[PDB]
Amino acid sequence: GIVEQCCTSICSLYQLENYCN
Amino acid sequence: RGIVEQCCTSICSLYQLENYCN
Amino acid sequence: RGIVEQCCTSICSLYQLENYCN
Amino acid sequence: GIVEQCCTSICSLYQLENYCN
Amino acid sequence: RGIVEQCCTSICSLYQLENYCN
Amino acid sequence: GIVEQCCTSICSLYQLENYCN
Amino acid sequence: FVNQHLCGSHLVEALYLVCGERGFFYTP
Amino acid sequence: FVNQHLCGSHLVEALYLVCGERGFFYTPKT
Amino acid sequence: FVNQHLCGSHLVEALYLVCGERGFFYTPKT
Amino acid sequence: FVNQHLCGSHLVEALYLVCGERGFFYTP
Amino acid sequence: FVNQHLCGSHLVEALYLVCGERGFFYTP
Amino acid sequence: FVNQHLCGSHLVEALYLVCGERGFFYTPKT
Ligand code: NA
Ligand SMILES: [Rb+]
Structure with a gap:
């Protein structure tokens, strides 16, 4: 995920x- | 003009x- | 209304x- | 203490x- | 007077x- | 340098x- | 004058500690 | 941009800059 | 609430949220 | 307008570096 | 009212992530 | 003053206090 x-x-x-909407 | 401003x-x-790096 | 506000x-x-988590 | x-x-x-007064 | 202020x-x-430590 | x-x-x-101008 | 952008920098930092394990969405 | 490492609140703090006008989702679940 | 780890300034930063209207004492002496 | 809460977030962060080894009390 | 000192605390933090590997100068 | 360790953004953050009215240069190149 994010942290990984x-x-x-x-x-x-x-x-x-990528984590933005 | 200027990063501060x-x-x-x-x-x-x-x-x-x-614009303001090095 | 809203966390921002x-x-x-x-x-x-x-x-x-x-109130605003997930 | 706090850090420990x-x-x-x-x-x-x-x-x-606990650390609040 | 005071750190806040x-x-x-x-x-x-x-x-x-x-002036405000410990 | 700074980080080192x-x-x-x-x-x-x-x-x-020292790092101030 | 109270600033949309700067204030939001502490809101996202606080939601990191308040929610923590569960997670959170943000939309300004 | 900083191409190394980004942990703790700084990982969340960077998502506020990178997205900005979009917002971000943060899901740590293993 | 975040039940892992909280070091450096972030340990002090969290004490500003948790207490808030009370204030906090920070004594690191071994 | 200068905000009681937000400004205090940097004051507690700075007192962490200024006092350091000795310690500090805060009351708003 | 928008504060010279406090706003600059986030500017130096952001320039750390934006420039990153190359570096940066600051003068207020 | 804090005589231990100061890494990440906190190293840059401290340079904003220590200098203040002067500004600071940050060059990490190995
Ligand atoms: Na701030
Ligand atoms: Rb950190």
């Missing part, structure tokens, strides 16, 4: 956007 | 913060 | 933030 | 309140 | 925060 | 000031 993706590994700008 | 007295997107 | 133009306790 | 209790182990809502 | 309605340096 | 100095080891008040 960005806190465990390297995150990105245009995909923590 | 342009991001306090109106809101700023992530692209105009990219 | 009700927690910016007057202060909010920890019980009305519990 | 909540930073080392699991903290709680109604007892970090 | 003196650091919200005018800005505060690191030496007047040192 | 204060995040890896113990930092100080009057030298993170």
Whole structure:
């Protein structure tokens, strides 16, 4: 999910956007 | 003009913060 | 009405933030 | 104390309140 | 008088925060 | 630099000031 | 004057501690 | 943009910038 | 409420919400 | 308009760095 | 009323995420 | 002053207090 993706590994700008509605 | 001015007295997107980096 | 309204133009306790979770 | 209790182990809502006057 | 007053309605340096510690 | 100095080891008040202009 | 953008920075931070385990949606 | 790591409240704080005019959903469930 | 972990300034930041109308004491001495 | 609650969020954060090792009391 | 000091606390925090790897200067 | 550790955004946040009327430069390049 959110935490699995960005806190465990390297995150990105245009995909923590993925989490925007 | 200036980050101080342009991001306090109106809101700023992530692209105009990219105007003020290094 | 709304968290935006009700927690910016007057202060909010920890019980009305519990109104707005998931 | 405060740090021993909540930073080392699991903290709680109604007892970090304990620290309120 | 008071940190609340003196650091919200005018800005505060690191030496007047040192007035309010423990 | 900045991160090498204060995040890896113990930092100080009057030298993170060093980073002021 | 009370600011839409700046105030919302603390609201999302507080909802992180208040909801915590369950989760939360935000729409401004 | 910062391409390393982003944990705690800072993960939620970044979602307020990145989205902004959209809002964000935060679901941690394992 | 968040039942895990709360370190650094976030430990102090949470004490501002939880107490609020009361205030908080923060004593770290070992 | 300058807000009692929001401003105080940075005051408690700053007192964490300024006092540091010694400690601090807060009363609003 | 919109405050020089307090608003700037979020500006320096955001520039940390926006610039990130490259770096940034600040002058108020 | 806090004589331990100061990482993430809090390292940048402290540079806003310490300098204040001067501003700060933040260069992380290895
Ligand atoms: Na603020
Ligand atoms: Rb942190």
